[PDB]
Amino acid sequence: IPEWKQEEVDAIVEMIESRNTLLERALDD
Amino acid sequence: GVPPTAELIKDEAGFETGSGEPQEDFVADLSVDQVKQIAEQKHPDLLSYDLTNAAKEVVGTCTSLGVTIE
Amino acid sequence: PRVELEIPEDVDAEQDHLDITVEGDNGSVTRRLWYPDIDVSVDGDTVVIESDEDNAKTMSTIGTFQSHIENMFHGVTEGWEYGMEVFYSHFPMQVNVEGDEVVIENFLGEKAPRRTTIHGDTDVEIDGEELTVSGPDIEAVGQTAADIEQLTRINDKDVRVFQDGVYITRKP
RNA sequence: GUCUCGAGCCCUAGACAGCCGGGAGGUGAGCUUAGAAGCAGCUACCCUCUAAGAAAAGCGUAACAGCUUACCGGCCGAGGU
Numbered sequence: 001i002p003e004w005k006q007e008e009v010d011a012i013v014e015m016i017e018s019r020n021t022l023l024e025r026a027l028d029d
Numbered sequence: 030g031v032p033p034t035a036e037l038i039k040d041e042a043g044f045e046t047g048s049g050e051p052q053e054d055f056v057a058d059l060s061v062d063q064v065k066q067i068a069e070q071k072h073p074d075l076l077s078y079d080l081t082n083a084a085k086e087v088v089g090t091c092t093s094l095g096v097t098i099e
Numbered sequence: 100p101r102v103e104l105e106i107p108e109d110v111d112a113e114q115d116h117l118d119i120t121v122e123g124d125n126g127s128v129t130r131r132l133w134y135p136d137i138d139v140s141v142d143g144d145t146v147v148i149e150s151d152e153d154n155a156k157t158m159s160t161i162g163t164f165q166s167h168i169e170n171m172f173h174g175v176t177e178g179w180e181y182g183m184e185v186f187y188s189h190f191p192m193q194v195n196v197e198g199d200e201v202v203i204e205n206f207l208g209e210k211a212p213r214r215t216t217i218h219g220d221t222d223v224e225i226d227g228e229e230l231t232v233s234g235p236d237i238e239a240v241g242q243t244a245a246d247i248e249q250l251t252r253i254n255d256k257d258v259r260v261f262q263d264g265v266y267i268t269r270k271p
Numbered sequence: 272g273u274c275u276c277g278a279g280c281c282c283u284a285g286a287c288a289g290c291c292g293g294g295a296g297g298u299g300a301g302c303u304u305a306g307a308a309g310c311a312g313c314u315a316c317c318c319u320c321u322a323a324g325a326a327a328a329g330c331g332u333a334a335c336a337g338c339u340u341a342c343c344g345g346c347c348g349a350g351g352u
């Protein structure tokens with residue numbers, strides 16, 4: 001699990017509260 | 030309509046030509062309030078939303094010419 | 100290995116021995132697919148290419164057989180079209196389809212006509228300066244197209260100055 | 272050419288390749304120069320927008336333009352290097 005892919009998920013989960021795979025992963029959170 | 034950035038630095042400096050080696054050889058000089066006037070002029074030219082990041086784009090030509098900030 | 104190829108609704112294919120016949124609305128193509136220990140059969144609605152051996156040489160041919168069958172599917176439905184353009188500098192080249200062969204007259208000033216025979220059920224249609232080679236068998240069409248370009252081959256003189264000839268413009 | 276064995280690294284959070292789309296602004300950086308605007312030379316090589324996008328890796332032009340490389344996204348789907 002690459003460190004940048006984990007940091008990008010934490011950036012997309014941040015904008016939902018306030019790649020298509022990284023968006024789907026963030027939606028499941 | 031609005032003139033280029035490279036010419037706007039040479040107006041409020043007093044110098045025409047730059048240098049042979051940038052950053053290593055200092056020619057011109059700008060202040061804190063002198064960069065805040067150039068930030069008000071360009072709005073459709075720059076992609077920046079805030080006035081803070083609009084200043085960084087002007088400084089991105091300055092230190093790579095021979096301009097010191099006080 | 101085993102690779103299953105689903106047959107299109109427009110197409111229906113029969114098989115006997117090593118030969119596979121593929122029929123459709125644009126025509127019929129029969130091909131011989133023979134290689135050590137590779138069995139090609141028709142399982143109702145799918146074409147099965149299988150072998151007990153998994154070596155580099157066997158794998159090379161299984162993949163070649165796949166592309167050949169997928170090409171036959173496309174040939175009997177949409178067909179195969181190669182587009183060609185005839186270029187001339189000083190001498191007006193007369194390209195015509197005389198019988199089952201395409202004849203090129205007055206090439207580079209030649210008195211004797213250059214001619215090549217058309218392979219199989221391939222059709223060569225000419226609209227002035229443009230030629231379109233078409234048919235169901237890619238082997239036959241690809242060659243007939245190439246044969247036309249090769250017919251104006253020049254070995255004696257510089258190809259850069261003497262650029263006359265029919266060239267392939269569109270590849271499918 | 273083909274067979275066999277080992278090692279590292281990458282990969283279903285989509286790898287390798289291919290194809291499509293994007294490859295943006297400050298600015299055509301400055302110096303040099305009639306001009307040189309990624310790409311003659313010298314020096315620097317900085318920051319916005321952003322999912323990416325070099326002060327430009329390769330052609331191209333008198334100079335532009337033009338073609339793509341980096342880099343990003345999509346289609347695809349299993350091993351790849």
Ligand SMILES: [Mg+2]
Nearest residue numbers: 254255256257
């Ligand atoms: Mg000679």
